[PDB]
Ligand binder design. Structure first.
Ligand SMILES: Cc1cn([C@H]2C[C@H](O)[C@@H](COP(=O)(O)OP(=O)(O)OP(=O)(O)O)O2)c(=O)[nH]c1=O
Ligand code: SF4
Ligand SMILES: [Zn+2]
Lengths: 251, 66, 763, 249
DNA sequence: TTAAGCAATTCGTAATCATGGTCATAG
DNA sequence: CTATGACCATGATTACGAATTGC
């Protein structure tokens, strides 16, 4: 019997708003460690890794290890019936093929209870090869988001060139081409870069733009690249865990 | 009952009392009695031991948009 | 099964000779027929089987006997354990059985029928003959009997009653069983079926089960035994399409100077005849080589083939086509001496059938799913067609010109793959007819034979809207002044719309082309829209019908009629539209604007349950855009504003669970002010009450006159003046127009009792 | 000759934004008492009752009781040409088939709109004055939210009112859910239950009713077994706006 | 085992893309 | 207590299938 109490329920809302458009149906692994979710996107061009540690929850509790095939669209709709201030409570029954979302309004004169139907998903599981990265770029999530929106007007793909001094994003199309240059500074407004080896990779702005729906989850985002491997886009979820997006490059 | 509902359905289709699908049942019974064709004294004696029920005091096709 | 009724005749005698009716309770005698009665159904089914053995008929007809009557009888005999029933055929030791079959084509669509086996005897359901030959709006017996001649739970209590009720039931059943005989002999069905079987050479059962392939296979084999050839088997899945027919670009608008129509008669069979095209003379690209004789041994086509001249071979398709062409010519020569109109159109039906047969000979060649395709021939045919029509247009516009001594240089306004509508310039119909006959006979002398162009009509005035959409007025001779209108393609001949819209388009073209008065046309369209918004339009004029085709294409995208059909009723999950029929519906008003498939309802259900109508749907989606097609080309875009302003003066006049909790507030008849008390007039509008009583009693007077003309018409359509009317015929305008005047009168009588009584009544 | 001056013209704006989507063509009964409007919705599933007392107006005046069938869509469009601060003035002529809307900007600008009236033979209904088992007062925003939330779960909402509190619930493809309110100034929830009640309503219509939220901080819901639910928004010192919805059986 | 062809116009539904009204929070 | 763009909501454009008629 699963039961987790999250006081800053807006976190859950933000999470689904960041997965729903990339993932239709996912599986939520619950355990004493915390909730976790790993799934390729529809396009099979990226992988999303969500980590919600039990510590972050204000009351966690997992008797039997659960695997909930959830329809992120239904869960998203349901989650929109929650105020950004309500206390959210996930609660499941090892025997029931349904998850329960209870929202408690601060005042407490109102309680919403939603029972969402689960489903059997035979999702295709993948294993990420723990590896090292030539470059790691930390920067405001809003800046990153804007960069991706900007270039999206120039072309479909973005070439991320990371050198010693700074990092560069660029694109081209019918209406010419452009590029943005970020250089290291000297908290959530600065840009730090860790270059062991200059790197250059091509990605689809379409997907990067999906990753950015997670912007409201963190002030900053870190980008981890390396020659001929999936780019890692990660957003930390303060004391809860994180949300990682892996995008395969274009060859 | 269930035998009284066939006597009225038999009174309603006998052609020697009139062409009656626009009016009530007791009005047609008294119309034939005025002219005195031969109304029988049993289709009266079930329209007295009942109140205003619409399945005794109504013609057979009192539904039916004709 | 409670009553079976039978009519029988020898063919050639103008009345029947047998008239029998078999009932299941004791009945009352009918003059002109025999009546027998039985106390059990086993005797009734046995008696009918013995009668059908002894009379021994050749042909069995009826209306929907295949899909309803015979399998009902067979299943009912199986349930009651009567062993001797299903032996209806001619062979003494054979019993009959029910078996499903389907037919499909792009010409008639797809239909699924049952068949029942009878050896020796022939079946002709008249429903299948109508559904194959004729394109109508409803296919009910009442609808086709009105179109050609002019006309379940009640029956269960007409049978559980007395014997004069059963006699009334038997007379009704005998009239039902008599109507398809009259239709069979009046429409010249069987005479045309016998002539079709004699001209094509196929049996008489194949003209009710098969298509147009077995007949052309039969004629080709019968012509192939006389020169010693064998047919091959080529089968391919699948080739590509080829290029069809040309259409000439119009000069759109309204014309008021006469245009003359010149066209070719029997175009594609005469192309196939006069250039010697056949399977058996198609020259392969190599077998000409290395012989070099091109001149008068072969010819070359615009698609590219080479075909041998007639001084070496004669093809087989020229001869089959020549026989069919002479048969149709004899049918037209017989049709040129009739005076009756319905007889004239049924001989037109016979000749139409022979022309369809001759054109399906050509269409056999290009059918890549078929039995023997040769798309080279089809391409040569349509290439010759395109070449000849552009030859016609160049020649007609080039010869008769201002420099060549004539009056005006003519200019072609239109041409559609067989015809040319040339505009000559003169406004005198005699001079246009004279020059048009000269042009047709002149241009025809540039071809082989039987290629001939002919004059056909003069349109005066003319109205050209788009490709395959025009209208005009028809002249055959001059002192035969005018014949009728022509409405090619427009909103008056299609069946996808409302009767209201087609009637308005016909009446607008009448007032606009015959009397040439646009002001009466505007006033007419205004009255139609005003009477629409004021809620005084019958629901016969609001019914839309659509055909329920194969279920997967209607799975692919959501429609209105499919949604109405697949939604069953609570009353009857055993009578619902099947595949191939037509679903009728009307659109009710609701607030789900994303979907017009959520507002559709059966006409009888909105009758018995009284749902309102969406007058804005009918105003902007059904009516408005056909009117903007028609009314614009005579004027500018101030005409769109003129009809949308004639709407605007008339759009401001609209008539109007919780509905039970009424308060019924009274209102002043003069100025519409709600107030306490029951008196009709308002205290400010009192000095004017004699005029307000005068007004509205001339409305009660006109409702009284409409009640009486309708409720006594049912007595003459029924037959009797002394018994009740029972006819809920959904295809009669009489039904549900006789229902609303009762309520109009109910309402208008109670509005005048606001005023006192005009005297005492108990004196 | 009718003439009414409304200083807080935004009230009129809010009113039309609350009727326009539910009603196409309505009839306004003007009189010395004030303006009034009662009309079934298109669907004929509900009834709207508007009450604008002359007292609320800063200058009322009605010589003749004149009522004109107004097209709420045209009147709505017209009313959007008014600032939320302009002084609005309704003015009609017993003889003219046109109503006049004059907007006076607080500070040099005056807008004048003459709207064409129309003859409407609207079907009048009479509400049966009755008593209610339950009356729930609550913030209009909370109510509005509730109806929006449930609308994502299913098409209808079951309103169950008991002793302690009231409950709204729905169900559909994606499961089901329910919201519970309990008794506890315009942030509070009061309940008057004489008899527990349970009724089913279409969220589609409740959502139309909520377009009136900007008219009042609070809204009261009045239910009773087998009768139309009453949703009412007060229009401070002017009058009110009542929505009656027939339940689903 | 069974079925004649192509050209063209009209209308409805879902999806794609533009634009304004609230709102939420940093200054 | 007040600017700014991010967010929800509603309306304009395009695409394609179905139906039906003219040659
Ligand atoms: C109607 C029709 C025409 N066509 C082609 C063949 C025709 O040669 C061409 C002309 O169409 P039509 O004018 O309709 O027929 P027609 O010219 O052969 O005979 P008539 O003038 O006496 O009425 O269109 C078909 O292939 N199939 C058809 O069903
Ligand atoms: S309603 Fe009357 S007129 Fe119409 S078909 Fe029936 S009997 Fe004839
Ligand atoms: Zn008055």
């Amino acid at each position: 019997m699963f039961e987790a109490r999250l006081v800053q329920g807006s976190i859950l809302k933000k999470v689904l708003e960041a997965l729903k458009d990339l993932i239709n149906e996912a599986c939520w692994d619950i355990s004493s460690s915390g909730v976790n979710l790993q799934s390729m996107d529809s396009s099979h061009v990226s992988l999303v890794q969500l980590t919600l540690r039990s510590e972050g929850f204000d009351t966690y509790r997992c008797d039997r290890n659960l695997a909930m095939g959830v329809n992120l669209t239904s869960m998203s709709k349901i989650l929109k019936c929650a105020g950004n201030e309500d206390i959210i409570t996930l609660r499941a029954e090892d025997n029931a093929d349904t998850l329960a979302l209870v929202f408690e309004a601060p005042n407490q004169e109102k309680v919403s209870d939603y029972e969402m139907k689960l489903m059997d998903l035979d999702v295709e599981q993948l294993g990420i090869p723990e590896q090292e990265y030539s470059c790691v770029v930390k920067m405001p999530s809003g800046e990153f988001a804007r960069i991706c929106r900007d270039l999206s007007h120039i072309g479909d793909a973005v070439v991320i060139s990371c050198a010693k001094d700074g990092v560069k994003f660029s694109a081209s199309g019918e209406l010419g081409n452009g590029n943005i240059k970020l250089s290291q500074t000297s908290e959530e407004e600065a840009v730090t870069i860790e270059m062991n080896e200059p790197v250059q990779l091509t990605f689809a702005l379409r997907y990067l733009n999906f990753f950015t729906k997670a912007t409201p989850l963190s002030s900053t985002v870190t980008l981890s690249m390396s020659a001929d491997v999936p780019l890692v886009v990660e957003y930390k979820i303060a004391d809860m865990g994180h949300l990682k997006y892996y995008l395969a490059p274009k060859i | 009952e269930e035998a009284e509902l066939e006597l009225l359905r038999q009174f309603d289709l006998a052609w020697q009392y009139g062409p009656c699908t626009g009016i009530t049942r007791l009005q047609r019974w008294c119309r034939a009695k005025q002219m005195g064709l031969e109304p029988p004294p049993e289709v009266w004696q079930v329209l007295k031991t009942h109140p205003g029920d619409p399945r005794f005091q109504c013609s057979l096709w009192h539904l039916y948009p004709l | 099964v409670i009553q079976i009724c039978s009519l029988g005749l020898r063919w050639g005698e103008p009345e029947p000779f047998l008239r029998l009716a078999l009932t299941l309770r004791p009945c009352a005698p009918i003059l002109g027929a025999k009546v027998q009665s039985y106390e059990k159904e086993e005797d009734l089914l046995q008696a009918w089987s013995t009668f059908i053995r002894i009379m021994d008929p050749d042909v069995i007809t009826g209306y929907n006997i295949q899909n309803f009557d015979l399998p009902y009888l067979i299943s009912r005999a199986q349930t009651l354990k009567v062993q001797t029933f299903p032996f209806l055929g001619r062979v003494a030791g054979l019993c009959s059985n029910i078996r499903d079959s389907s037919f499909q084509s792009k010409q008639t669509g797809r239909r699924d029928t049952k068949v029942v086996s009878m050896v020796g005897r022939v079946q002709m359901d008249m429903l299948q003959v109508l559904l194959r030959e004729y394109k109508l709006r409803s296919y009910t017996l009442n609808a086709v009997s009105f179109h050609f001649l002019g006309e379940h739970s009640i029956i269960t209590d007409l049978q559980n009653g007395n014997d004069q009720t059963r006699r009334r039931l038997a007379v009704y059943c005998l009239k039902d069983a008599y109507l398809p005989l009259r239709l069979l002999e009046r429409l010249m069905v069987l005479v045309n079926a016998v002539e079709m079987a004699r001209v094509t050479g196929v049996p008489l059962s194949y003209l009710l089960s098969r298509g147009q392939q077995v007949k052309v296979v039969s004629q080709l084999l019968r012509q192939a035994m006389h020169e010693g050839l064998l047919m091959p088997v080529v089968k391919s899945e699948g080739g590509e399409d080829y290029t069809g027919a040309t259409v000439i670009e119009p000069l759109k608008g309204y014309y008021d100077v006469p245009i003359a129509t010149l066209d070719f008669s029997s175009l594609y069979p005469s192309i196939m005849m006069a250039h010697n095209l056949c399977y058996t003379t198609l020259l392969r690209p190599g077998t000409a080589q290395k012989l070099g004789l091109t001149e008068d041994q072969f010819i070359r086509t615009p698609t590219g083939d080479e075909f041998v001249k007639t001084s070496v071979r004669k093809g087989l398709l020229p001869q089959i086509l020549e026989n069919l062409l002479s048969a149709r010519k004899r049918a037209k020569a017989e049709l040129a001496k009739e005076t009756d109109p319905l007889r004239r159109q049924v001989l037109d039906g016979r000749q139409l059938a022979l022309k369809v047969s001759a054109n399906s000979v050509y269409g056999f060649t290009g059918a890549q799913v078929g039995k023997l395709p040769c798309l080279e021939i089809s391409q040569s045919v349509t290439g010759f067609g395109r070449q000849m029509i552009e030859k016609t247009k160049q020649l007609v516009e080039s010869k008769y010109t201002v420099e060549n001594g004539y009056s005006t240089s003519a200019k072609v306004v239109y041409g559609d793959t067989d015809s040319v509508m040339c505009r000559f310039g003169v406004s005198s119909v005699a001079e246009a007819m004279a020059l048009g006959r000269e042009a047709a006979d002149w241009v025809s002398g540039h071809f082989p034979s039987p290629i001939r162009l002919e004059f056909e009509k003069v349109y005066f005035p003319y109205l050209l809207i788009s490709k395959k959409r025009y209208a005009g007025l028809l002249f055959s001779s001059r002192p035969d002044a005018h014949d009728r209108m022509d409405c090619k393609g427009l909103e008056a001949v299609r069946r996808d719309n409302c009767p209201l819209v087609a009637n308005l388009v016909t009446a607008s073209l009448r007032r606009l082309l015959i009397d040439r008065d646009p002001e009466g046309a505007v006033a007419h369209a205004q009255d139609v829209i005003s009477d629409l918004l004021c809620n005084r339009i019958d629901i016969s004029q609001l019914v839309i019908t659509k055909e329920l085709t194969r279920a997967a294409s209607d799975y692919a995208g959501k429609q209105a009629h499919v949604e109405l059909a697949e939604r069953m009723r609570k009353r009857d999950p055993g009578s619902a539209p099947s595949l191939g029929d037509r679903v009728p519906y009307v659109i009710i008003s609701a607030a789900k604007g994303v979907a017009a498939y959520m507002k559709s309802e059966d006409p009888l259900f909105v009758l018995e349950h009284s749902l309102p109508i969406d007058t804005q749907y009918y105003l902007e989606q059904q009516l408005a855009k056909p009117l903007l097609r028609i009314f614009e080309p005579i004027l500018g875009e101030g005409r769109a504003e003129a009809v949308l302003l004639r709407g605007d003066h008339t759009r401001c006049k609209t008539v109007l669970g919780l509905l039970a909790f009424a308060k019924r507030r009274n209102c002043c008849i003069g100025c519409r002010t709600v107030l306490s008390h029951q008196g009709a007039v308002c205290e400010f509008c009192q000095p004017r009450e004699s005029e307000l009583y005068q007004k509205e009693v001339s409305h009660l007077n006109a409702l009284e006159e409409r009640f009486s003309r309708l409720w006594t018409q049912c007595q003459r359509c029924q037959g009797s003046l002394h018994e009740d009317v029972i006819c809920t015929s959904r295809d009669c305008p009489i039904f549900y127009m006789r229902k609303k005047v009762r309520k109009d009168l109910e309402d208008q009588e109670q509005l005048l009792r606001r005023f006192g009584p005009p005297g005492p009544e108990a004196w």
